Write a protein that binds this ligand. Structure first.
Ligand SMILES: CC(=O)N[C@H]1[C@H]([C@H](O)[C@H](O)COC(C)=O)O[C@@](O[C@H](CO)[C@@H](O)[C@@H]2O[C@@](O)(C(=O)O)C[C@H](O)[C@H]2NC(C)=O)(C(=O)O)C[C@@H]1O
Ligand SMILES: *[C@@H]1O[C@H](CO)[C@@H](O[C@@H]2O[C@H](CO)[C@@H](O)[C@H](O)[C@H]2NC(C)=O)[C@H](O)[C@H]1NC(C)=O
Ligand SMILES: *[C@@H]1O[C@H](CO)[C@@H](O[C@@H]2O[C@H](CO)[C@@H](O)[C@H](O)[C@H]2NC(C)=O)[C@H](O)[C@H]1NC(C)=O
Ligand SMILES: *[C@@H]1O[C@H](CO)[C@@H](O[C@@H]2O[C@H](CO)[C@@H](O)[C@H](O)[C@H]2NC(C)=O)[C@H](O)[C@H]1NC(C)=O
Ligand SMILES: *[C@@H]1O[C@H](CO)[C@@H](O)[C@H](O)[C@H]1NC(C)=O
Ligand SMILES: *[C@@H]1O[C@H](CO)[C@@H](O)[C@H](O)[C@H]1NC(C)=O
Ligand SMILES: *[C@@H]1O[C@H](CO)[C@@H](O)[C@H](O)[C@H]1NC(C)=O
Ligand SMILES: *[C@@H]1O[C@H](CO)[C@@H](O)[C@H](O)[C@H]1NC(C)=O
Ligand SMILES: *[C@@H]1O[C@H](CO)[C@@H](O)[C@H](O)[C@H]1NC(C)=O
Lengths: 96, 48, 129, 439, 48, 48, 48, 96
């Protein structure tokens, strides 16, 4: 079958970034800000946290777009603890 | 962890089990062994 | 069947042919098989006014119920349903112009479905010891 | 050479070794309906295929001639097996299966028409149950195509697309009956397939002709018979493990199945058209463009049939060669022992036997195998009396107990020199050992 | 006219290749038959 | 360009089919010659 | 050429079978030459 | 084909276009070793390829089998051996 598939033997890049209070301006530039080309395949770890022994699911949100200005549609895929909210809107995206 | 890799239009050998689940796959142009697997349409080609 | 998930409704072989489906309305599952296709092996003798027909690998019930009805006599031979020939496999012939396979022949006087025995042992009644 | 003598290893003990050889004498009789293969049920394809005219008549004619050659070849092989076979009507294989300590029960099936199709030996039963697609195998597989089974047999898909294997004109049960008759013709009088003499005597004379004295053969008759049926048992047990003859038999079925499956796969090749399916072309395009796409499929499928028919002609030529070799081996190894050294298998060939096999014949070649050797000093000739030369017949001259004696070349048994084991010459050649005291 | 003539040329050339392949096979059988005839001359006629 | 390349593919595949058919026919003659050579070794060199 | 399907697989398969027949034939010829050959360990090319 | 040769070998053009002759499974040197072994097997003991007797005696018995008396045949042994080696030399010189 011929389809949109990853190249076997190529390298995955862990683009997830965890911060506490400060955000580095370098996190919002190349190579983190990557070109989409035909597309991407994502292998995402479901970071299972616990509060009062109650399970919570967290993972990095991904945005896909072009200029990230409200003159353009940005697709956003965001988790909400078991609910995957997917939107494509003329968002006024932040600098950071 | 959010591992990403680029996609491209590629030919793959997809193996489906008796319940329709893709259990194994081969990227045909990735290596010489993958080319043999796709040529013979099998995961373990005969000795040759 | 139990292999159809929520988004799946068609079953395909390795060659891209549709071989099964799940009906979108009733959720009932069916396998699709090709309709029967085959040939008739007709044995003809120049002195005859008819033919002896062999439907290879088909039972006479199948031929009459699913292919075509006919008024000719018939019987289930080893090779398949035979029409317009008498079942005489107990008889044998050393020469045969209508060889049907597996040591069977069609002999014309009507047509007879007869065993073909081109070679036999020369027998003697002398002692074996 | 020391003096006039050379060092030679002469056997001091021997055994009989059996060797299998499968010779393909037949192949599955593949028939294609060119019209049904190229066009299936589609009237728009059949109209165009008629404009290619005689291409399907050539495919059909060449395969009918090829199948006629296979049928003629099978009749010639059966004629060869039954040629000159004379049997006593008193012969009952249920009671008569061993003579002179040699057992043929496994090589001999029931004899006579009262059995029906049960005239197959234990040896042939053991050889046929390891091959699924024999003549009866193909008949049973095609019988199951209309049984309503959920199993999608590949032979049923091939036959519905016009690719069907027809049974041979003589069933493998008839050929096993012919090999059974040819086998019993060697064991009992008139011994019509064993030089007109008892089988044990024929084995003894064949071993003697290799250079073995008759004195050890007629006293070791029990050992020879036990070595012979042990060699036969070794051949039978050899089929329970990876075997070259059984693999050769299975290669006929595997190569035919691979060729037929490869021919069926041509119905899914697009040949540069929009689809390989005539239904998809006819449901997407009108006659002006559908005919262009259908013509691409017609040229591709007819090209595939011409290629398959060329391959089938080549393979059947190899099968005719193999069947000619099998007929020659029957006549010159089983019915008689032709003076050709490695024709009937390798080594010191004593005798050969034949059994039916799927699409061919299995020959069992029995050879004289030395077990232990003695290094001795031999003289290839002697100069005796008034310079008369003598050469040994199928043997050598030996100094045994400081006296000139003769021994066979294949078994060390020193015996006196006599006119029975000597070729005389009025003059002795140079380098013949001088022995004035002989005779 | 070139399009129609090309269809005829391809058909006639395809048929010529099929005839040539059949002729090669038939002549191989004639060579085997002639070899058998020479063996029969040498081993049945000129000698026994 | 696809129409032109398709004409070349059909011609080149037809040529390979013709060459393969000829090669099968020639190897049958080579097998026949090798059988004759093995027979001559056995019946003229190792024995007479 | 990928839209033609198994044409190149068939050409490669037929040539591989033809070459397998040539290899098997060469082994049979070599086996025939070496069958039953016994030599003395005392043989020397420079003296005999 | 990969050498810095100005000569355009037609075999290199064929191989670059996908047409190549592969070597046989057994080298011709191995087959020459087998024909050499088959030839020396007739000259010396145990004469495994000469009916178990010396080569000169095998030649003499083979000539006698044609209807030649053994007397002239064993008295002319050197003439027969020289005729045999002269025949072999004639075959070798015939290739020129
Ligand atoms: C992309 C990356 O490299 N990501 C790492 C992150 C950054 O390097 C850091 O944020 C950059 O900062 C800039 C841009 O200025 O450091 C982390 O580790 C910290 C120590 O390095 C972590 O232990 C924190 O340590 C504190 O002292 C503090 O405030 O950093 C107290 C705070 O309570 C505690 N956070 C907790 C409890 O999660 C983190 O998380 O932030 C682990 C992340 O994988
Ligand atoms: C056929 O099967 C589908 C899939 O299970 C059924 O659709 C579901 O119906 C229920 C009840 O209305 C809904 O809660 C689900 O969300 C539906 N799933 C989907 C994927 O649509 C359907 O009802 C079945 N119909 C029949 C006649 O059996
Ligand atoms: C076709 O004829 C044969 C031969 O008469 C039938 O086979 C015999 O059937 C009887 C029972 O009616 C048995 O006792 C015999 O032993 C059978 N002989 C053989 C050679 O098998 C056969 O049944 C007939 N078939 C049909 C459908 O008429
Ligand atoms: C010699 O003749 C005897 C008598 O016919 C044979 O003895 C029989 O041999 C079989 C084995 O083939 C035994 O099962 C029988 O019990 C023997 N019967 C008797 C009465 O002894 C013997 O085989 C013959 N031997 C030879 C070599 O000719
Ligand atoms: C067919 O008819 C001809 C002419 O009467 C006759 O020679 C031939 O023997 C007949 N054969 C049979 C099988 O009836
Ligand atoms: C063989 O069978 C035929 C037909 O039954 C018969 O005519 C012939 O005489 C038989 N063969 C022998 C040797 O009797
Ligand atoms: C054998 O057949 C002949 C000819 O019918 C007869 O003379 C003889 O008596 C028979 N012998 C036996 C034992 O049946
Ligand atoms: C011959 O060999 C067999 C098997 O080794 C042995 O049983 C037998 O006693 C030997 N006979 C002689 C004469 O050495
Ligand atoms: C044919 O079908 C029967 C019944 O399903 C089965 O027992 C048999 O094994 C089948 N044989 C073949 C050759 O398909």
């Amino acid at each position: 079958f011929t389809g949109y598939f990853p190249k076997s033997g190529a390298n995955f890049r862990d683009l997830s970034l965890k911060g506490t209070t400060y955000l580095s301006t370098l996190w919002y530039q190349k190579p983190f800000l990557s070109d989409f080309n035909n597309g991407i395949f994502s292998r995402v770890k479901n970071t299972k946290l616990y509060v009062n022994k109650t399970l919570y699911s967290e993972f990095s949100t991904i945005v896909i777009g072009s200029v990230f200005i409200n003159n353009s549609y940005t697709i956003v895929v965001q988790p909400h603890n078991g609910v995957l909210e997917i939107t494509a809107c003329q968002y006024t995206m932040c600098e950071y | 962890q959010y591992w990403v890799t680029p996609l491209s239009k590629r030919q793959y050998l997809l193996k489906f089990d008796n319940r329709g689940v893709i259990t194994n796959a081969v990227d045909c142009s990735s290596s010489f062994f993958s080319e043999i697997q796709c040529k013979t349409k099998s995961l373990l080609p005969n000795t040759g | 069947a139990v292999y159809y998930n929520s988004w799946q409704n068609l079953l395909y072989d390795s060659n891209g042919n549709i071989i099964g489906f799940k009906d979108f309305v009733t959720n009932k599952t069916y396998n699709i098989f090709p309709c029967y296709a085959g040939r008739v092996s007709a044995a003809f003798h120049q002195n005859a006014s008819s033919l002896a027909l062999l439907y290879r690998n088909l039972k006479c019930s199948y031929v009459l119920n699913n292919i075509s009805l006919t008024t000719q006599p018939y019987f289930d031979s080893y090779l398949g349903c035979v029409f317009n020939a008498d079942n005489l496999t107990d008889y044998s012939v050393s020469s045969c112009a209508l060889r049907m396979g597996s040591g069977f022949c069609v002999d014309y006087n009507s047509y007879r479905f007869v065993t073909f025995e081109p070679f036999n042992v020369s027998f003697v009644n002398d002692s074996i010891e | 050479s020391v003096g006039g003598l050379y060092e030679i290893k002469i056997p001091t003990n021997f055994t009989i070794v059996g060797q299998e050889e499968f010779i393909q004498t037949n192949s599955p009789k593949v028939t294609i309906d060119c019209s049904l293969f190229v066009c299936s049920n589609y009237a728009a394809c059949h109209d165009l295929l008629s404009e290619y005219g005689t291409f399907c008549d050539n495919i059909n004619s060449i395969l009918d001639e090829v199948n006629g050659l296979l049928d003629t070849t099978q009749l010639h092989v059966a004629d060869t097996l039954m040629q000159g076979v004379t049997l006593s009507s008193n012969l009952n294989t249920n009671l008569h299966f061993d003579v002179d300590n040699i057992n043929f029960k496994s090589l001999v099936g029931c004899l006579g028409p009262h059995c029906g199709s049960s005239s197959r030996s234990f040896f042939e039963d053991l050889l046929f149950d390891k091959v699924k697609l024999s003549d009866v195998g193909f008949v049973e597989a095609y019988n199951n195509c209309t049984g309503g089974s959920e199993i999608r047999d590949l032979l049923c898909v091939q036959s519905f697309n016009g690719i069907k294997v027809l049974p041979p004109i003589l069933s493998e049960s008839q050929i096993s009956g012919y090999t059974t008759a040819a086998t019993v013709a060697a064991m009992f009088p008139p011994w019509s397939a064993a030089a007109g003499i008892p089988f044990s005597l024929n084995v003894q004379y064949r071993i003697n002709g290799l250079g073995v004295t008759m004195d050890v053969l007629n006293k070791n008759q029990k050992l020879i018979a036990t070595a012979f049926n042990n060699a036969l048992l070794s051949i039978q047990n050899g089929f329970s493990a990876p075997n070259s003859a059984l693999a050769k038999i299975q290669s006929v079925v595997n190569s035919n199945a691979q060729a037929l499956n490869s021919l069926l796969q041509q119905l899914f090749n697009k040949f540069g058209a929009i689809s390989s399916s005539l239904q998809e072309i006819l449901s997407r395009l009108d006659p002006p463009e559908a005919q262009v796409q259908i013509d691409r499929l017609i040229n591709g499928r007819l090209t595939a049939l011409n290629a398959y028919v060329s391959q089938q002609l080549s393979d059947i030529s190899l099968v005719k060669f193999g069947a000619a070799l099998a007929m020659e081996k029957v006549n010159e190894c089983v019915k008689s022992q032709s003076p050709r050294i490695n024709f009937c298998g390798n080594g010191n060939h004593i005798l050969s036997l034949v059994q039916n096999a799927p699409y061919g014949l299995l020959f069992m070649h029995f050879s004289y195998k030395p077990i232990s050797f003695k290094t001795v000093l031999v003289s290839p000739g002697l100069c005796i009396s008034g310079d008369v030369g003598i050469a040994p017949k199928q043997g050598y001259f030996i100094k045994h107990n400081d006296h000139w004696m003769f021994t066979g070349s294949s078994y060390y048994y020193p015996e006196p020199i006599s006119d029975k084991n000597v070729v005389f010459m009025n003059t002795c050649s140079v380098n013949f050992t001088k022995a004035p005291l002989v005779y």
